[PDB]
Design a protein around this nucleic acid. Structure first.
Ligand SMILES: [K+]
Ligand SMILES: [K+]
Ligand SMILES: [K+]
Ligand SMILES: [K+]
Ligand SMILES: [K+]
Ligand SMILES: [K+]
Ligand SMILES: [K+]
Ligand SMILES: [K+]
Ligand SMILES: [K+]
Ligand SMILES: [K+]
Ligand SMILES: [K+]
Ligand SMILES: [K+]
Ligand SMILES: [K+]
Ligand SMILES: [K+]
Ligand SMILES: [K+]
Ligand SMILES: [Mg+2]
Ligand SMILES: [Mg+2]
Ligand SMILES: [Mg+2]
Ligand SMILES: [Mg+2]
Ligand SMILES: [Mg+2]
Ligand SMILES: [Mg+2]
Ligand SMILES: [Mg+2]
Ligand SMILES: [Mg+2]
Ligand SMILES: [Mg+2]
Ligand SMILES: [Mg+2]
Ligand SMILES: [Mg+2]
Ligand SMILES: [Mg+2]
Ligand SMILES: [Mg+2]
Ligand SMILES: [Mg+2]
Ligand SMILES: [Mg+2]
Ligand SMILES: [Mg+2]
Ligand SMILES: [Mg+2]
Ligand SMILES: [Mg+2]
Ligand SMILES: [Mg+2]
Ligand SMILES: [Mg+2]
Ligand SMILES: [Mg+2]
Ligand SMILES: [Mg+2]
Ligand SMILES: [Mg+2]
Ligand SMILES: [Mg+2]
Ligand SMILES: [Mg+2]
Ligand SMILES: [Mg+2]
Ligand SMILES: [Mg+2]
Ligand SMILES: [Mg+2]
Ligand SMILES: [Mg+2]
Ligand SMILES: [Mg+2]
Ligand SMILES: [Mg+2]
Ligand SMILES: [Mg+2]
Ligand SMILES: [Mg+2]
Ligand SMILES: [Mg+2]
Ligand SMILES: [Mg+2]
Ligand SMILES: [Mg+2]
Ligand SMILES: [Mg+2]
Lengths: 113, 197, 386
RNA sequence: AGGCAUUGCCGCGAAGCUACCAUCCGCUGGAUUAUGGCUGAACGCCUCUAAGUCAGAAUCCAUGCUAGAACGCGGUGAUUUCUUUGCUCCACACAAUAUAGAUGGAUACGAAUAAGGCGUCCUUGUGGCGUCGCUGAACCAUAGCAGGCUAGCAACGGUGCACUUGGCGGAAAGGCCUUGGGUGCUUGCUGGCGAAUUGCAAUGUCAUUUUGCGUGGGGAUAAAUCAUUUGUAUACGACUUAG
RNA sequence: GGCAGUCAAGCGUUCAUAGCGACAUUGCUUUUUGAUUCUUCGAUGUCGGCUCUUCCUAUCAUACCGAAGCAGAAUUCGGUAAGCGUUGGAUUGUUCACCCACUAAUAGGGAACGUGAGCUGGGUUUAGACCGUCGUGAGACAGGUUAGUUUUACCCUACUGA
RNA sequence: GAUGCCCUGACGAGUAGGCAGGCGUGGAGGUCAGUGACGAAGCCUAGACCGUAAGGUCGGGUCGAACGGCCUCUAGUGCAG
RNA sequence: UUAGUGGGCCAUUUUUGGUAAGCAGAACUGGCGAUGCGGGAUGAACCGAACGUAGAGUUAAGGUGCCGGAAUACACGCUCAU
């Protein structure tokens, strides 16, 4: 989702020209990582070996306001909210032969010996 | 029959050679052409220069880098003739053209390998004597190829080395053909002559 | 239908694309034809554009209305400390063009040059050429064999030189490195010359002389993204024009149904490589000389540096070249001076030049005084002097 | 001493930017067209033309100048451990991988073609003599459990492998040749033993890549980017600087 | 309509063809205008100018040449040639025209009669208004006159740079 | 199963259009003493089978209360515009 | 007894108007419309040939240097074009 955004040197570590710093997204996702870490502590998982094994954002139902346009027209002005979910996880580390083939294999071993 | 065939381009006619090479590659024979600068085209030089100028006139009007591209080197004029006799936009055609290499002069490693000719394309067997013809190196130079003199210098050097090689083999072929002649009038040689050898 | 009145097109299609040059140091794309009778010599040299100033001289041009009269002429001063030689490259002719066969480097490279091999000098362990230098150990047969290669096979030989940017007033410490072609002599004589100058300097007076025509190769001053009116010189549209007037009105016919490469469009202006030819050398300055701004007519002991320093540059403490008129590039820019590719025998080219006077007033305003002493005489004593 | 007057207004004004409103600079070879010629037949003469050829335009192609193929190429510098023993090379296994398509051998003068090749001789030549072609339908190789195990004879030859000797090769050399000894094999010739049942055929598996992984042996001991910083640079990236 | 051939009666002091050329007759062109009505009427923005690029050659100038009723100078006819130029103004909405002037020269044309999300809007071509002729009248006029909203690109490609 | 079974010969393009034999949907009479909370209907399913095709059938997942085959009757009965 | 149709268009030959037209209008036949398939690069109508699903053989029209299936076949001549 990057058409006509800007270019930046901080993209280079990931091989891209287009990157950004979406603070509101970052804050919500850090709240969820904090919640998942806590939940893992309560189950007694080892916090040093936790990785993000699943993260998924889905579109929630839009929230609708309106904007007023020239010539007495009205258009939508909708929010595009999110469902986010994540999971952290501890890391952890018959042969069929024709008679001819059988005959070959036998002959082969009778010579090798 | 050979896994690579090296054709000495010298004295052959561009189109007739192109047509045979094109068919060979489509049949899965690897080919190398050498001495593309010595290749001929029927028609006097001036006519062939005029034809090349007609070709230079063609270019995408709104941007000349969009082709057609006018390659000037002898090897690439030959490659153009070939590319036109192959379905070069298909995968089969791309594969076929990967089985081909064309060079000016005879670079290594092909300088020490046998070179064949293609009689159906030889100028000396095809043109009526008296008909005028172009040599492709001269043509290429006239339309902007830059390495006629370098190839000529390098070819003169290769031919010195090659003449020395030949002088030695021609000497060793005497010793052999001598020793084979003393072997005649033996029982074995007379027996062989019965069986056609 | 035909354009109603004829005019020449705007701008030259031989300088396309108008894009940012690939490097800040413009490439010499042709060296002079080698005459192998002559002694071995560099065909070019590196310098830094200091600034411009003004000259008076008498004109020697019989038939001119200004024959044997004083003219004033703008000049450009290039700061040219000696270049250090640090290597040789042998090129061999092929049917695909020249190819470098091998490079040989000097045993010891200065940090001015070593810096050119790094983007982050301060953090580095400074390992450049550390294993290579050890090739020179023993007799250094490794080097002798590589030189023998060059002598055997090469058709042209070029020396790698670097500037001594430490000697300039520039803030940069990383030297510029460039190949310069050796003309004169046999291939063996050329690679010997190069071997006997590893780590040694070469002075601009060895390369150039007074009155010689030379060529300036430099990247032009940058001006960023520019509109069509200034970038191509198209006519401004009338004041009544809706949607702006620094434009081309028609960017094409209906057919071809494509904008053509020959139409003027907005884009990068400046920072292009350029090769300007036939700049006459009016002075080869010595750095040691305290009177390198003085002449035979003006015996005032002074340097070429104008009062205040060259604006945005500094002093000039080194050998320099003074060239008639202007050259591409801005103050502080690396510049390559090259010997003429042809033998000009114009009367303009053959004129022996002798300067009457070199201006040395401040270029940071409407300078009125050539020297501090001249100022102090005219003003008299001031309150700060007491 | 200052504020405000949407830069309050006026004079000067550095820097920067900038103007045929300012200054500088703008290359020299080749091939041709028209045309005029040379030699010269057709056509015993003549003829610029037929073969052949000379000069020649603001033409064309180079030189020179701009870009540099983001799937064109070269040279060269340094290549991280110090702890998940990371990197590399070599040998050897063991896995996978997947093939634009092995299945005795790509077997090297150059030049001419109304001419040549080979051999030979000598006064060494644009020489004399002989011979060859009329296609590679050749030449070389080629027998042995996909090629076993053994005994002799005759030659001292052929050939493989590893190792050495010296040389030559830069067009893309990465190959060609050579010395010496070693070790196999030898179908040049003569013997002895083995082979079965893959059941009357079934590719009946023998090649070649690419990568991983494990053993043993060697070898080497960095940078780049972000952030900061510069302004010769700049819409942003990018560029150029410094730490 | 425009441009070019062939024939050659004549013109050209003399002399068909230097330059021309009657009577005839063969063509080419699509910068004229017709003819037609195939495409578009759920719309391809409708004159001209301005700007800008590129193409043709049937060459005005410039290069090199042939011919002459080419002494010189000036000019005229022709060839290779489109490489390079081909303008400033008065009146008119003009296209076209016309004149002044400079010039080496002021050649002809094409690109949706190039070019309106490029301009402009003088003309034309809605609705206001005047005149003349026409019409009993409402009204008409490829007659004159005056006033009359010129919209959108952030997409794809192309191009210019990154 | 005589609307059956079978033998023989020939033929097969198609817009507008005509006619024929079929497939599918809501509801009605009859019947299968039909299926079903031990899972009806619906929905998902680069799993399977039958039919030239309309379509039919089966498995697996999901699900929770009804629903089908055949003989007939009837229509607010089949969508890409 | 009832549907659709009652805009046609093209080729060869005959033919009228027109300088002519891929123009306008008639005659006879065959077509396209309603029709794919092989050929004519391409194309409503030209040439061949009209079509259930398959297999084998043979051909039409058109082709056989290479693109491309098929003789760089055979034979007698002609032609060199700045
Ligand atoms: K953006
Ligand atoms: K126009
Ligand atoms: K103020
Ligand atoms: K003659
Ligand atoms: K019409
Ligand atoms: K319409
Ligand atoms: K003028
Ligand atoms: K008004
Ligand atoms: K029922
Ligand atoms: K009817
Ligand atoms: K009817
Ligand atoms: K048909
Ligand atoms: K067809
Ligand atoms: K037939
Ligand atoms: K083709
Ligand atoms: Mg975009
Ligand atoms: Mg609003
Ligand atoms: Mg309102
Ligand atoms: Mg070029
Ligand atoms: Mg014009
Ligand atoms: Mg300018
Ligand atoms: Mg306006
Ligand atoms: Mg100043
Ligand atoms: Mg001739
Ligand atoms: Mg590149
Ligand atoms: Mg529409
Ligand atoms: Mg529209
Ligand atoms: Mg439009
Ligand atoms: Mg002409
Ligand atoms: Mg027209
Ligand atoms: Mg128009
Ligand atoms: Mg508009
Ligand atoms: Mg308009
Ligand atoms: Mg437009
Ligand atoms: Mg108006
Ligand atoms: Mg009105
Ligand atoms: Mg934007
Ligand atoms: Mg039918
Ligand atoms: Mg109902
Ligand atoms: Mg269910
Ligand atoms: Mg699905
Ligand atoms: Mg319920
Ligand atoms: Mg209904
Ligand atoms: Mg629907
Ligand atoms: Mg429908
Ligand atoms: Mg009816
Ligand atoms: Mg009717
Ligand atoms: Mg009707
Ligand atoms: Mg009609
Ligand atoms: Mg119809
Ligand atoms: Mg055709
Ligand atoms: Mg074929």
């Amino acid at each position: 989702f990057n058409s006509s955004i800007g270019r930046t040197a901080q993209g280079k570590e990931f091989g891209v020209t287009k990157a950004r710093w979406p603070a509101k997204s970052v804050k919500f996702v850090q709240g969820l990582l904090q919640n998942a870490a806590a939940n893992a502590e309560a189950k007694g998982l080892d916090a040093t070996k936790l990785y993000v094994s699943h993260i998924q954002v889905n579109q929630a139902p839009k929230q609708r306001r309106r904007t007023y346009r020239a010539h007495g027209r009205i258009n939508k002005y909708e929010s595009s909210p999110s469902h986010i979910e994540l999971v952290v996880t501890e890391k952890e580390e018959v042969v069929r032969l024709t008679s001819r083939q059988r005959g070959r294999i036998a002959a082969q071993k009778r010579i090798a010996a | 029959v050979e896994p690579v065939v090296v054709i000495d381009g010298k004295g052959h006619l561009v189109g007739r050679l192109a047509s045979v090479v094109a068919k060979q590659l489509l049949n899965g024979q690897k080919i190398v052409v050498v001495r593309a600068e010595e290749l001929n085209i029927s028609g006097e030089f001036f006519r062939n220069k005029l034809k090349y100028h007609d070709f230079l006139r063609k270019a995408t009007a709104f941007n000349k880098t969009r082709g057609p591209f006018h390659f000037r080197a002898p090897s690439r004029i030959f490659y153009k003739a070939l590319r036109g006799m192959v379905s070069h936009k298909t995968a089969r055609g791309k594969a076929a053209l990967e089985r081909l290499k064309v060079f000016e002069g005879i670079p290594p490693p092909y300088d020490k390998k046998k070179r064949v000719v293609v009689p159906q394309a030889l100028r000396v067997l095809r043109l009526k004597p008296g008909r005028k013809y172009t040599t492709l190196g001269k043509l290429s130079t006239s339309v902007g190829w830059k390495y006629e003199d370098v190839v000529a210098k390098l070819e003169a050097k290769r031919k010195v080395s090659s003449a020395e090689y030949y002088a030695k083999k021609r000497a060793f072929t005497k010793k052999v053909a001598s020793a084979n002649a003393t072997a005649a009038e033996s029982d074995v040689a007379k027996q062989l002559a019965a069986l056609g050898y | 239908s035909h354009r109603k009145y004829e005019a020449p097109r705007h701008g030259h299609l031989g300088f396309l694309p108008r894009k940012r040059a690939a490097s800040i140091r413009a490439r010499v794309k042709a060296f002079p034809k080698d005459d192998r009778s002559k002694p071995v010599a560099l065909t070019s040299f590196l310098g830094y554009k200091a600034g411009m100033t003004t000259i008076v001289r008498d004109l020697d041009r019989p038939g001119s209305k200004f024959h044997k009269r004083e003219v004033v002429e703008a000049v450009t001063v290039v700061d040219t400390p000696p270049v250090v030689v640090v290597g040789v490259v042998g090129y061999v002719e092929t049917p695909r063009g020249l190819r470098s066969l091998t490079t040989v480097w000097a045993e010891h490279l200065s940090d001015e040059v070593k810096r050119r091999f790094y983007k982050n000098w301060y953090k580095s362990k400074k390992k450049a050429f550390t294993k290579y230098s050890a090739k020179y150990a023993q007799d250094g047969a490794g080097i002798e064999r590589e030189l023998a290669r060059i002598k055997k096979y090469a058709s042209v030989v070029r020396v790698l030189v670097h500037t001594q940017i430490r000697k300039t007033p520039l803030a940069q410490k990383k030297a510029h490195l460039a190949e310069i072609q050796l003309n004169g002599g046999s291939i063996s004589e050329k690679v010997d010359w190069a071997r006997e100058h590893f780590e040694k300097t070469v002075a601009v007076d060895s390369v150039f002389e007074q009155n010689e025509m030379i060529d300036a190769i430099a990247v032009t001053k940058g001006h960023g993204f520019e509109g069509v009116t200034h970038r191509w010189g198209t006519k401004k549209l009338p004041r009544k024009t809706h949607r702006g007037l620094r434009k081309v009105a028609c960017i094409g016919a209906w057919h071809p149904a494509h904008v053509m490469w020959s139409v003027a469009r907005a884009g990068q202006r400046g920072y292009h490589s350029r090769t300007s030819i036939n700049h006459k050398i009016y002075r080869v300055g010595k750095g040691d000389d305290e009177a390198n701004g003085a002449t035979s007519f003006d015996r005032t002991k002074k340097t070429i540096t104008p009062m205040g320093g060259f604006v945005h540059y500094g002093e000039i403490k080194n050998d320099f070249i003074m060239v008639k008129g202007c050259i591409p590039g801005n103050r502080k820019r690396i510049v390559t001076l090259r010997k003429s590719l042809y033998t000009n025998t114009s009367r303009k080219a053959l004129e022996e030049v002798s300067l009457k006077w070199i201006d040395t007033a401040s270029k940071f305003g409407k300078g009125r005084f050539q020297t501090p002493a001249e100022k102090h005489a005219f003003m008299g004593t001031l309150k700060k002097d007491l």
